[PDB]
Amino acid sequence: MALSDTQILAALVVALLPAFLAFRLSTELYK
Amino acid sequence: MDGSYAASYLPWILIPMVGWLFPAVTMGLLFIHIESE
Amino acid sequence: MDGSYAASYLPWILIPMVGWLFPAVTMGLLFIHIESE
Amino acid sequence: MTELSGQPPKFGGSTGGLLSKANREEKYAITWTSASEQVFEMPTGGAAIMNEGENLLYLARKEQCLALGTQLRTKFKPKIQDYKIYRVYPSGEVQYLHPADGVFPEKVNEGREAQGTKTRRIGQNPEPVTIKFSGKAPYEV
Amino acid sequence: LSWSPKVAGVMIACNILAIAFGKLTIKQQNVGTPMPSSNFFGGFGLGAVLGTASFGHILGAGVILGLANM
Amino acid sequence: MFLISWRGYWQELIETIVWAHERTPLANLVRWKDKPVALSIVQARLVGLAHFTVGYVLTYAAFLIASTAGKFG
Amino acid sequence: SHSVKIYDTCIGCTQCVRACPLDVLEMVPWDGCKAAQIASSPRTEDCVGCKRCETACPTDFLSIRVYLGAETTRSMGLAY
Amino acid sequence: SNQVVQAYNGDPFVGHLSTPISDSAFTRTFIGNLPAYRKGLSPILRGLEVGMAHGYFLIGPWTLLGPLRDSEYQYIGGLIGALALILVATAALSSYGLVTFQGEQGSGDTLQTADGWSQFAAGFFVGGMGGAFVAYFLLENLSVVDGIFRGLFN
Amino acid sequence: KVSVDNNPVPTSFEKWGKPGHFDRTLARGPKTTTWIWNLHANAHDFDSQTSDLEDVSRKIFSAHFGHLAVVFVWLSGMYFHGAKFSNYEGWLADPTHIKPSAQVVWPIVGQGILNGDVGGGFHGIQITSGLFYLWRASGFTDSYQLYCTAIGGLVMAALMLFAGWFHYHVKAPKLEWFQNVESMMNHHLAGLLGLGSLGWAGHQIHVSMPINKLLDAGVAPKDIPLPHEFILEPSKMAELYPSFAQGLTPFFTLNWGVYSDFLTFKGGLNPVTGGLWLSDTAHHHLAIAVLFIIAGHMYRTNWGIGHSMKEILEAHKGPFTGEGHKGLYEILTTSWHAQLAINLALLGSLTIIVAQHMYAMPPYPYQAIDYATQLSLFTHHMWIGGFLIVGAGAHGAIFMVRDYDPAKNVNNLLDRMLRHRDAIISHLNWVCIFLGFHSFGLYIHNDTMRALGRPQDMFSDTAIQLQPIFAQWVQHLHTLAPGATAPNALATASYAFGGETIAVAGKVAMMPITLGTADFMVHHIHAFTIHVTALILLKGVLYARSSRLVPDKANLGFRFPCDGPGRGGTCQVSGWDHVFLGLFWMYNSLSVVIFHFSWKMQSDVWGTVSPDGSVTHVTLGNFAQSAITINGWLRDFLWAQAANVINSYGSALSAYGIMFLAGHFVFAFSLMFLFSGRGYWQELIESIVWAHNKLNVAPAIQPRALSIIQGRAVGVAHYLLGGIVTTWAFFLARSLSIG
Ligand code: CLA
Ligand code: CLA
Ligand code: CLA
Ligand code: CLA
Ligand code: CLA
Ligand SMILES: CC1=C(/C=C/C(C)=C/C=C/C(C)=C/C=C/C=C(C)/C=C/C=C(C)/C=C/C2=C(C)CCCC2(C)C)C(C)(C)CCC1
Ligand SMILES: CC1=C(C/C=C(\C)CCC[C@H](C)CCC[C@H](C)CCCC(C)C)C(=O)c2ccccc2C1=O
Ligand SMILES: CC1=C(C/C=C(\C)CCC[C@H](C)CCC[C@H](C)CCCC(C)C)C(=O)c2ccccc2C1=O
Ligand code: SF4
Ligand code: SF4
Ligand code: SF4
Ligand SMILES: [Ca+2]
């Protein structure tokens, strides 16, 4: 009934793109 | 110390990464940045 | 894999020599020769 | 002759242009005088906007420069027949290559010299037995 | 699901919503076959009013068959 | 491959590989001393002839030996 | 470089000069034909050996020959 | 304008394109700060940096996929294979620098010089065998590393 | 908006006696024998004869009518041979046991042995095209309906021929009628595709559903009611389906839920006949008709509403893409070759989609049981699709050479794609080499690990296993689809994803195809060969204008042999020779694809069935551990399954042996044209002209060798003919031997 390892890895992959998008926002907020 | 949850192998590498590997390269990049000209 | 013949110790060193040590120094000497001026 | 006067044409940039041979061994440069702001296809790839007046374009081979000269002389109704193809070295020297006599090679003028002209037919060529070890060629001697 | 004023009511309501949609966002509307007047809606014309009534029917079959099973 | 295809295709391909090596960032350190071109026409004819020959000879020396050594050995 | 030799069978039809896309051939004056001109190749270090001059020539066994000799950066046509 | 891909370094006749993969700000601050490219280093240190990341990962494909993964001498065969590969690698690049930089000996950009590339070869060999031996030593004592990351030696 | 010129070309037979009049250099006189080959090399090059965009377009339109007459007389021949010289009513009496045959052979030289006993006393050659199952799906009962369909097809063949003569010599349309591309697109969407789908939906409702329903009940031939009798008496149709007593009236009030008994969404297969459900396909064609005619009103023609495609192409422009599609509407309505390249690309991919869909969802009754029909239909549609995709790569290059004007499309997508041709091809060949090592070197690696006696180091399933997890997860989603993500569907989309084993007449129709590591390796082989053919054709498209080797490629033409032996050598540099190489690479790609299909389906899918539920396959499950080796592909597939072509003499499958050896002959004959060059053969032919001049018999037509492009063309033509004939003979003889 608990979670699986593939759900945790999918959560890491689906949170990888907020890291890229926050990197884009931080870069354009610096300049 | 182990993990009963799913993916117990993952904090075994994420705790030293965010503890050492993330702050060492963050302080390295920041010290290179704030002391350059 | 062994050798029932006399001097079974000898292909044990002659097979890696003619396989690696001879062609590496032959190609090294030839590439030094054909690209020099 | 020694100085290239011109502006670069309007072009976005390509990949088949000047490679690492340009700043090391040699490159070429075509200069011509346009009439309007028309569009020409460079042999590097894609189209470019030919600027008004005297403009300069850097290429990597002489064959691309002569292919552009053919495109300038045939594929326009104001036929551009006053282009000059120079060879630029990385040392800075510029060699006037074409049409260096001043007139095009398709027509004859006085001042040229017959270089590489034989006085015989091809059937009157010598045989490679009499010059078998002289080191020369059967067509040269 | 058969002929009723309920299915006809939601059909006519989404149809006239589609007429308002065509009157709001069609780029060129009038230049077709001319309508006799402008009494219906807008200044559409014959082909334009056939188009927005047909989109009213497409939208009609959409919400009706989307609610006949729900 | 050397028999059917000819040189001009492979020269157009080698132009692109040269461009990719000259515009890859970390491989701009390693540059060729001799300019890489395609094999010449008579040359790669001879190479395809050599592969046809030694390929023929190796597959027949495999079959001719093993079939009659499987039947009589 | 290649060697472009032009024999005396040339009739001065200047097809080979306008066919070669590298500007090695050029018409020099002559007195052995009706056109009173013959092609000549001074800039043989720019010839790649494409033999496009040996496709537009009207004589039997064409009066211009391109003997493929040595190679270089120009004769191999390399942009790198 | 709003176009993100432009000509490389202003002039549009060099065969390259200023592109968000090629010439973005992040690319020219990350590739330009890689050891083979960042300014202010001798080639011995930058060869030592390049060598360590190459030696550290070459242990992997032979300790997991090599022929000695059946037996108990798994990591020893992985180290032996990677030492052979880095020895061939430094033989290739030292012979490259032996034959390419003979002659004119250009002054600037000291990596592309014969003494510079030989310093790069010495650095690559030291970093290569050291990264290979560290990855071997950290894979052979994996029970120790697991014990000091889980904290069971206390 | 119709613009027609009246009588542009006079009808006359005097031009037929002067061959070569269409081109300027051919009508002078056949001074040389190469003129003969040029007469066939420029006979359809309509862009080189006329250069005004109006004469060529009406020439194309009349050529379409002539080719349509060729397809109609071919289809008439199929229905006539199914009427007169077949056993269609005999096969309809007993479909499971006897085998179809629609060609009887005249016994003249001993070829009466080709008329094998196909079942029921009828002799003939057993057909593998499988259009008998098409006829049973449509609803044919007796041979007279096939005969009248052949007669009506020949009538429409002569009608299309008369329309071609009428539209070239009597009333030919103008250029503005051809350039009305939005009217052409929405008429072809609604009135051709959607209206034709509605016609076949009506035929499937009225004819194909009741006839196949009572044929699945078990009604014998000469007892089925005639297909018009269901319309003439609707009670015979209302006793089969309860919804036909409701009439047309629930359709117009959107009471379609009462039509659910005869427009079902069953899916899967029919367990009685081993095909798709006819109610499912009737509902399917009706839905495609509605969606196409809806999409058939998108483009404005005369009434204001509608999308003119020009501002559609104007509106799509991003930061990477510069000016976007600005100029493509002027390209695709002024150049027929760009339209031909797009249409050949999408028709080729459509035909490959047809092959990849007609094996796991068999749409015809008793089609999945006949293994020869299934294998032949798969591989033939695969080959037609791959051929048309190579033609897309050809006509892209012809558009670049002779139909590309660079002054009109500046900084658009075509100019930007031609501006970074190196950054496309130098990554495409990298992924070609990466896929080449990682799909073929895997095969060499476990070939070597099996030859060195160490099977634990291979890439097998018991060895290091490369499990294809993505397609296995997709198969799990398709198995879990009906009830969760397709709740009104009873069965799956197919039984190849996952489900029960469908058995009809002692054979297996479709069982779930599991994907081991052998399917992983062979799919990467498929992606590799697809990438290489899409490298040769794409670098024939992009490098057709100019290059750094030869920057004068546009003035030399599309079809030239070389620029010369200079620059090291420039032979096979044109855009034509990339098609010449891509044809071999299409041959290699599709040969491996149909080999993977034939072996996987006869090792893991086909075979007989047993009443306790166990399935025994044809090759007893060889694909698991023996499809990962090159020696496994040679021994267990090309040696073991070719024995049915080898040992079949003195029998019905005897022509396939002398087509097997025939295809090997044409392959080996192609090598003479591919390997040798022209000047040898010219130096030899001139000696034969000497031997003819010695006896005063030398012809005044000057006899000389083929052109260099001609030599490469006949080499690739005989290569592809010989290889495809060999594979055709092998596949047909094997799958007719196994049943
Ligand atoms: C927040 C993160 C964090 C984490 C995860 C740790 C973890 C650890 N600390 Mg620690 N510490 C921290 C913060 C942290 N600390 C802070 C903030 C302080 C200051 C108050 C301290 C002060 C401290 C002291 C005073 C001591 C520790 C010790 C220890 C270790 C106990 C077991 C041991 O001896 O390890 C053995 C040592 C190691 C595992 C060191 C790491 C070496 C690794 C294995 C080599 C990998 C390098 C590799 C080549 C590069 C890979 C490249 C990469 C990209 C993959 C343990 C690893 C004890 C110790 O002995 O540590 C040395 C000890 O005495 N810590
Ligand atoms: C013709 C000669 C030849 C010989 C003798 C070998 C021998 C070997 N190959 Mg090999 N191979 C060859 C040709 C040859 N190959 C060719 C032509 C190819 C290309 C197709 C390959 C491709 C290949 C692959 C793909 C693999 C092998 C592997 C192996 C090894 C199997 C056991 C192992 O893991 O070793 C362990 C590794 C070694 C013994 C490496 C040598 C390191 C030595 C011990 C260090 C000595 C250096 C010393 C400091 C210098 C001394 C100085 C001197 C003057 C005395 C074995 C040593 C397998 C392997 O794992 O090898 C790494 C493997 O996966 N080979
Ligand atoms: C090209 C296909 C291919 C592949 C994938 C393999 C793979 C393998 N072979 Mg092999 N082999 C091949 C062809 C191939 N072989 C051929 C053609 C032959 C000759 C007939 C052999 C002969 C052979 C022998 C004799 C043996 C093997 C063995 C092996 C296994 C271990 C070898 C090893 O450690 O590699 C070492 C490889 C490397 C050190 C290179 C690693 C490259 C890295 C991964 C690239 C990374 C790129 C990176 C991800 C990109 C991003 C970088 C950055 C930007 C982040 C391995 C599964 C051995 C075994 O035991 O089998 C199980 C063995 O004994 N092979
Ligand atoms: C919609 C389909 C279509 C259409 C309309 C065209 C139309 C055209 N193509 Mg084309 N092509 C297509 C598909 C198509 N192609 C495909 C799919 C391919 C890939 C194979 C090609 C490959 C191709 C090439 C390579 C060339 C053309 C060329 C041309 C143009 C001139 C045609 C010509 O001279 O041939 C006239 C007809 C023939 C020469 C007859 C060919 C006979 C073949 C080779 C043998 C048939 C074998 C037969 C099936 C087996 C039985 C025979 C025997 C055993 C009994 C013309 C515009 C040419 C061109 O534009 O040059 C400027 C050109 O060079 N095409
Ligand atoms: C069986 C013969 C054969 C082979 C092996 C190839 C192989 C190849 N062709 Mg090819 N070709 C052939 C026949 C063949 N062709 C024919 C007959 C034609 C005529 C139409 C063509 C036309 C053709 C075109 C038009 C193109 C190719 C291209 C390619 C390359 C694609 C990259 C790839 O697969 O990864 C590389 C795969 C291999 C080299 C095969 C794997 C073998 C093993 C794994 C390697 C050996 C292991 C190791 C090195 C051994 C060491 C031993 C040591 C002593 C050296 C590849 C080298 C393309 C290319 O080069 O660009 C990408 C390309 O554009 N081919
Ligand atoms: C993040 C990221 C990335 C990266 C990744 C990777 C790929 C990484 C790698 C990593 C690695 C690869 C690492 C490594 C490391 C290493 C090291 C750390 C080593 C060290 C060594 C040592 C410690 C040794 C020492 C010694 C000894 C012991 C003895 C001998 C000598 C010597 C001294 C040398 C990329 C690019 C994608 C992008 C962005 C993101
Ligand atoms: C593939 C190919 C190429 C490309 C060939 C290239 C790029 C050569 C690359 C050779 C690689 C480096 C392998 C060479 C190593 C071999 C094992 C040979 C060993 C070296 C000897 C000196 C012993 C051509 O240039 C060519 C030219 C004319 C007709 C056909 C073709 C042709 O088919
Ligand atoms: C043999 C050969 C020739 C010579 C080709 C010739 C002589 C063509 C032969 C044609 C003869 C006349 C056979 C006729 C062709 C068909 C059989 C005609 C069909 C006739 C029947 C229907 C009656 C080349 O010209 C050539 C050119 C470039 C590369 C390779 C080659 C090459 O290999
Ligand atoms: S083409 Fe021949 S005949 Fe004419 S000028 Fe040149 S060499 Fe003389
Ligand atoms: S070979 Fe080419 S470059 Fe040389 S003279 Fe002839 S046409 Fe000119
Ligand atoms: S071999 Fe033939 S195709 Fe190749 S360059 Fe020479 S003449 Fe041209
Ligand atoms: Ca082992």
Tab-separated table of C-alpha atoms and ligand atoms in Angstrom, chain F residues 6-7 41 45, chain I residues 561-566 569-572 708 712, ligand 11:
chain	number	residue	atom	x	y	z
F	6	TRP	CA	32.274	6.029	-54.458
F	7	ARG	CA	34.439	8.819	-53.138
F	41	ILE	CA	39.281	6.234	-56.187
F	45	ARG	CA	38.852	0.206	-55.227
I	561	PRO	CA	27.768	11.353	-62.316
I	562	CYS	CA	30.645	13.392	-60.948
I	563	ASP	CA	32.561	16.625	-61.092
I	564	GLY	CA	35.750	14.795	-62.053
I	565	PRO	CA	38.711	12.920	-60.579
I	566	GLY	CA	40.053	16.109	-59.017
I	569	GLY	CA	37.811	12.335	-56.658
I	570	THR	CA	34.210	13.519	-56.777
I	571	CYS	CA	32.303	10.505	-58.080
I	572	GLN	CA	28.854	9.922	-56.546
I	708	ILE	CA	27.558	6.316	-65.548
I	712	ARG	CA	24.483	2.804	-61.286
J	11	SF4	S1	35.621	7.422	-61.407
J	11	SF4	FE1	33.938	7.992	-62.831
J	11	SF4	S2	32.362	8.922	-61.486
J	11	SF4	FE2	34.289	8.870	-60.263
J	11	SF4	S3	35.238	10.900	-60.641
J	11	SF4	FE3	36.121	9.495	-62.197
J	11	SF4	S4	34.772	9.750	-64.005
J	11	SF4	FE4	33.645	10.640	-62.246
